[PDB]
Design a protein. Sequence first.
Lengths: 457, 457, 203
Amino acid sequence: FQGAMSSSIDISKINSWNKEFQSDLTHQLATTVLKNYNADDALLNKTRLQKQDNRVFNTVVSTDSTPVTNQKSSGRCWLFAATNQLRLNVLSELNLKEFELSQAYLFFYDKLEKANYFLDQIVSSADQDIDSRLVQYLLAAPTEDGGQYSMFLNLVKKYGLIPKDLYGDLPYSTTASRKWNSLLTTKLREFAETLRTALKERSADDSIIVTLREQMQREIFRLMSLFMDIPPVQPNEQFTWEYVDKDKKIHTIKSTPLEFASKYAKLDPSTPVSLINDPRHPYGKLIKIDRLGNVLGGDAVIYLNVDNETLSKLVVKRLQNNKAVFFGSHTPKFMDKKTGVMDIELWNYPAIGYNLPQQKASRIRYHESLMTHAMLITGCHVDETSKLPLRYRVELSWGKDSGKDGLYVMTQKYFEEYCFQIVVDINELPKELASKFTSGKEEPIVLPIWDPMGALA
Amino acid sequence: FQGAMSSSIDISKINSWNKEFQSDLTHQLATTVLKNYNADDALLNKTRLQKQDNRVFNTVVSTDSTPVTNQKSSGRCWLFAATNQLRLNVLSELNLKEFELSQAYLFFYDKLEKANYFLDQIVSSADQDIDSRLVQYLLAAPTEDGGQYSMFLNLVKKYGLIPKDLYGDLPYSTTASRKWNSLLTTKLREFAETLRTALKERSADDSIIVTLREQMQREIFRLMSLFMDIPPVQPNEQFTWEYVDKDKKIHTIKSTPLEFASKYAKLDPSTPVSLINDPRHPYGKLIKIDRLGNVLGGDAVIYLNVDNETLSKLVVKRLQNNKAVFFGSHTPKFMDKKTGVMDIELWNYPAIGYNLPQQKASRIRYHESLMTHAMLITGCHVDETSKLPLRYRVELSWGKDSGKDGLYVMTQKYFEEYCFQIVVDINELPKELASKFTSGKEEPIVLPIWDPMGALA
Amino acid sequence: QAYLFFYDKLEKANYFLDQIVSSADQDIDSRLVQYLLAAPTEDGGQYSMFLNLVKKYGLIPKDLYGDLPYSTTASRKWNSLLTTKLREFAETLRTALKERSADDSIIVTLREQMQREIFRLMSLFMDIPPVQPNEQFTWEYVDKDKKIHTIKSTPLEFASKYAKLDPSTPVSLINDPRHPYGKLIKIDRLGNVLGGDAVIYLN
């Protein structure tokens, strides 16, 4: 009783505290303003903004990102950032004013594969109770738009890449995927039950289950074809692409989606590796996300955990190698979309006595921070006096009206605190780190499918 | 040199002061917020608003103000408030759902009379230099829309009143008078020179001047008739008015503008007197504004100076007599148009250390406060425990969307500090005060034409 | 432009206090005193007032101090709040001067306290510029060829070296048919920086 009493909200206490707070001028001011406007709007520090909103970068890639892409109302950030990195290769080599790889192409296959992947996950977990943590998690959002870089390579290895001119964001569902996802997911939840019920009496290898699963794929594909068309050409089938360069000259390229990805997009699926700064685990260790994927039997989500100093130097190096850097972060934490600034001190929260001492590792464990979006670093500014990078130039996929012409500026501190993963090529890694991937000695730290360090959705 | 040096802005001093201010948390908070939003928007105190926005009034007139009037982009507040007071008499007696006296009718004649009045003022001051304080003041805004209650009676005595149904705000210039005023004023400034030049060699009584003045009236009238039509009937000419009551019954009234004002509007020009609270001068004294007027040879602007206790009791009494009260104040000082609240403590300026000790009398002398608008008190709330009024119900002429359905709530403190004049009937005054007007002993304190206690423009 | 705006308004507020002291012998309702009280912190100015500011404060790139604050692009409310305070101060000064001379330490202290309050209120709506007139600033920029450059200068040096402004050369000419041509025209009392150059025109 005494404990519960002491743990209760006492009316006298709160009213007494109120009197005390009201006697402080800063509090009087704070409560007046905070009842009138959104805290971020009220506390935006223009004195800080004046200095931090710096668009001068001494280390940039040679090719411009034209035009600015927009994923619209969908969680396709990762696909846009992954292709935004490769599109530059076509723009530069083919001397084009504007060019985009088809994001919709990868989106269609990703969603189809995920739906199929889900059916397999349900079969493999049919031994567990319906209310179990895993089964419930699988049923929560099976067709979500978000993904990881490994999931991106899985799709490219199987489907390749094609120019947006052949398959674009025309369908309503590519730019407003919520309803389509809802309709598919409702069906998948129905299917999960049909599968589990059938499995109570039969084994997964039973022809009855095999037939049931195929009928389900057929229905999923059928429903999907109503909202988006299956791409016009198969992965190994030839397509014809007509285009104009910057000199007004016409050219015709005949290729296959798979050849296009290697020959023109310059993507060698064997080179990219993901590095992450996850302070919850020791550095130098491999981190693996259990069950997360899209294409059945594809590569798993694996990261090499490294400290921020290493992560930062790798970003600078890749930029010097004339390559943009795919990265994941906690959007929209400390991100001002109007000005396009990512700075953890941009809002004067200390002025109202609001401070946050919880550290990165703990923020992750305590449900406070996670990877939610994927973006592209296309430049940075290295301090001349032998110092490290001070800020980074970031390309978003939210249209030209977001940030400054679609571009954002991120501080080094933000990168260290609210960013987690970067993608680089294995040849850019020191032999010390590269070996972690090449050798067969490394035993990965296996994390649950629900771990915060996952898909950039 | 030493004095000028000490009186100069020293760069070291301001930067030193800045460091000191920045060390204070309230200041840090204040400057962050104040660089983001308008001070009134930021400092609006909702804790105060919650209590002060009270629309319960125990002392109200019996007739509703329907419909809400809108002067639009013109300074016709005084005409609207003066007629808003009388319209209630027609609404009540004729059992009408909606009714308005023509504000445009009075507006047309007021502007014509003022233009003519100006010509006379120029003639009477032709002995003074062009750069003199008086002549320059006369040339500043001869056709301004604003006026006083005495100027209103001057027009009604000569022109009477008519229903808006016969002459409304149809013309562009009635609701957006700026351009029309500019065009007339430019002409009047030309005329002022022609008159003064002609007077250098001739006396005002010279037939040449008399002819010149008439030609000027003709041109002023001609230009005015281009923007508004002269009313359809003369003051002593009969008009026919058809209307419908609340019971859907049709009626026809045949009258003249002059008869209508007395018979239907119930206005006896001999009864209204203006009282004012001008702490610069002793109470019990008559105050007169030199040269201010509209109709040549009309009544002057005269006020009986009384204390706030007297002013307040008179407002309560008139309301109990079932009559609304015409009043002038300093709009938009401490007036929140969105909520329709007039309260000097509604914004938390003390929170940023912004306090204003300057008293009413001094605020007037120091160019800080003056009469700028005319409104109508249609109710008030008298505290039951033998106390005085706590708040007043105010009708504005800014449309139904301003304030709360066009209505505002004003505190007693606001009335005492930012209001100056009220209009009551002489029979409502104690014999002590009524005698000030009736006897011929009272010598008025004569103020300059430019005095802050003037026209509600 | 904000750089000059901040200092101009501060100087004008201070200038006003001096104008009030110098005219304390005149009645409150006099033409001059009333004119001084009408709009002491107005945004407008003359070219001579511009040179006054540049001579004392110099110039800096907008990249270091721009129109971010609400009051730079909607100055009315800020002006109203400052002016209301200045009108209060005008009375406090005139009242104190009825018994004491302007040189009295009491007046000198009063005036300084007033400057402090004016500056304090101003710092709430705009920040004092990041560098002092003779203090060095660092400016990073990109040319038309995409090349990066770093300029280290002071506001005063920047105005001469980069903006190419020599304060001794500009003169104002005016066409005022009210007066004979060839004559110099001077506007009495108009200014911003106390003791700065006057508004003079050659007709």
